[model samples]
Target: GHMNVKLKVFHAGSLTEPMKAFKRAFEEKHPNVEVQTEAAGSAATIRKVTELGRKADVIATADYTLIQKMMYPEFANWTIMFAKNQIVLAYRNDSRYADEINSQNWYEILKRPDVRFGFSNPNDDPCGYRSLMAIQLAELYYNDPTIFDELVAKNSNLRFSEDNGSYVLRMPSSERIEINKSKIMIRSMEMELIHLVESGELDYFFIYKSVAKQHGFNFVELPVEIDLSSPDYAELYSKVKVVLANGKEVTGKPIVYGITIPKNAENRELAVEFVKLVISEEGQEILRELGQEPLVPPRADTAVPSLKAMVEVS
Candidate 1:
């Protein structure tokens, strides 16, 4: 008799859709293996295994650096950078000024007194911190030093200050933080805002482009220079940074997704095979269909015989 096997995967909440697609396809191919997945903010998702000591065969994050920062040496070694995404302003048809907003005027629309917008918690989600970075960089792009202040500071206690040459966003202590619920909201994960936008509770939100497209939400495409979407802007993107609640600093960069099999994985063989399928043409196709661009030839920090044998590395 054959025993059932479960392949546990912890991934970024923004990847829910693509993970679903992959799980379906993978399961159809390996009927005996159950692909169980859990999704949350990228940091929290990784912490589940790293901090809580949970067993996950595969771990994926919206920010590749998280793997290097939190899991390397102890939890995992070697990371495969397999996908990329960008930030966008997500809104619905009924959103205020939705009928006329464009990349150039989107920020202005969000500044309206009657409009309400939101972003995830910087301390808990990469998208959350990236949202702050996007807003800060927008000030330079639009030549308005007050863009971040008027939109974020005037509404809440979060402040962005220049450090050496980079901008640093400091969030007030949670106990002392005040929220103007009428103008802004912050959740632990970006996906948590989808229903709020859909139900009209929110007029706009800073979220990943793939998330917007995945949920059929209308979005304003920001410029490549400020959107943190292109490798060419990696240097410019690094100018903004955020210090999380735990006092860790993260610099802005193009959105890259990374995956790895943890050192303590319960089923290493199954995890490796699953990762092989993800970097394959079939998995890349699924990612494209779900709005996330897959790296044709994935990049890895180092060569892992199991992974290098299956994926092309730069």
Candidate 2:
């Protein structure tokens, strides 16, 4: 028998809860495997491999394209789209104007001078950029041209330029984001915002709907047009994009989560077993129970034999 085989996973902060559950069950079955999970903004997680040269047995991201764009044919080969989620305005009952927030009036509430809200950094977290996309999309759906200006632009160095019918948000270097702390709070990733929401330090925040529900915080389900949840809205969603500090351009699309095994993984066999469990029936149920929607017969873009057996590869 071998000593503990540490299976390190770098995943999106939004997947923290489910990853913990997956780790628990996987370890229950394989007592000798010790799982080490790391949570970061999906981009930051990928950078740990691409930029920092750190190795993780598995790399999961909130946006599948991060894998397609950041690590392909080099650090990793294929990706599996495992789960999906959408944006919501999360808050606790004790938050300012909490009783008044709802799908219809949420934007107006966020614009109030006394209300302090937060979102993760657009340059680091997909949730952060998607949050901005939602606000800009709201401008189109609600016919309020000033929504983005009032809620975000004036509060930070971030701004947008419109050409024809689309809007492009320009994000500055991470250190130059220039957010007005008096009006808005910022974190490197979305999960850290959960604490401010829990303590009422942030009156509200833009977060994945699943993350909100898991923490027992009340949230407003944003309209489908802007939530990045429906495949039906992909065309409209694409009209909003963010150019991050790293010169990467991300389009708004239905939120999909991806997982991969890095080429440099130390415990390759263990990682494969871990991923097999993640895509198994039990794994799908584990995600469903945690408030995320799992893709039946998870989709993959791989030729890896072990993965191809479990997923529908394209």
Candidate 3:
């Protein structure tokens, strides 16, 4: 009989459902292992290992770069880009202007004083920064210089300024983003605000397309140029930069999900096996069914022999 083992995974909030599936599947395969999963915004998720000095067998983030930025060289040397996602404006069917809101005019609709909208904290979640990027890019895509100012700056203490032709979103520290309760809201994780929309406490909120789909909420499909969902727009997306609370500058890029086994993992072998399961076709299919698009032939920058054999080096 095998001895009992515990598999600890700290992952992004948006990965909640898919990770649950992975947990169930993995536990079924290894009856002696108990999978423990925790979910939060990507930054906060990784902070559990980096800042809080917590132990986790596996770590996954909504933005792949978080793993590279926060964990590489210290916690882990390699990360696997396992999946892709996009930002969307999620709302319930009973939302205001539900019948008329479309991708083209959704920002304008958000501008209406009576309509409330929300997003996660850019300092804490990738979706938060991407939401800011989408709104900033919307200014360029819609050819309306006032959109960001009117919708974001006016409602929050944060401001976006142009620097050498590129836009810089100056994020605040110590002081939390000021949200106008009458027309705006903010949360630490995008998924945390989903309930607000469903309950009519919020008219809309910026979230991952997969989350909206998994929750069965209605969402507006943003343009590929600003959705952060397509690699084709990577260069254009890079034009916007967000400075986080820690003064770290994160450039906008297409949404990518990353996973890794930290150096301090208690169960290295089990972590490797779990990582293999996640990047394998079986895991990818589970993600696809949950509305997240899997990266066919997942890519890893650098990996140990065990991981290298499971994923392709890109």
Clash count for each candidate, listed in order shown: 0, 0, 0
Candidate 2 residue-wise lDDT, 86-184, digit = tens:
999989888999998898999999999999999999888999999999999999999999999999999998887998899998888998889888889
Instruction: Report the alpha-carbon TM-score of model 2 versus the true structure.
Output: 0.97
Scored against the true structure, residue 178 in model 3 reaches a CA lDDT of 79
Q: Which ranges in model 1 have alpha carbons more than 4 Å from their true place? A: 172-177, 312-314
Model 1, 147-239: lDDT tens digits are 999898888888888878778887655466666898998888999999899889999999999999989999999888788899989999999
lDDT of each: 0.88, 0.92, 0.90
lDDT of 3 by residue, 1-314 (tens): 45889999999999999999999999999999999999899899988999998999999999889888888789988889999999999888889988899987999899998899999999889999999999999888888899889988998887889987689987887266677788888888988998888889999999999999999889999989889999999988998999888777889998989999999999999998899999999999999999999998899887568866778885
* Better structure of 1 and 3 per lDDT: 3
lDDT of 2 at 131: 96
lDDT of 3: 0.90
* Model 1 TM-score (2 dp): 0.96
Candidates in order, TM-scores: namely 0.96, 0.97, 0.97
lDDT of 1 at 74: 96
Best by lDDT: 2
Weakest lDDT window of 10 consecutive positions for candidate 2: 300-309
Residue pairs whose backbone atoms clash in candidate 1: none
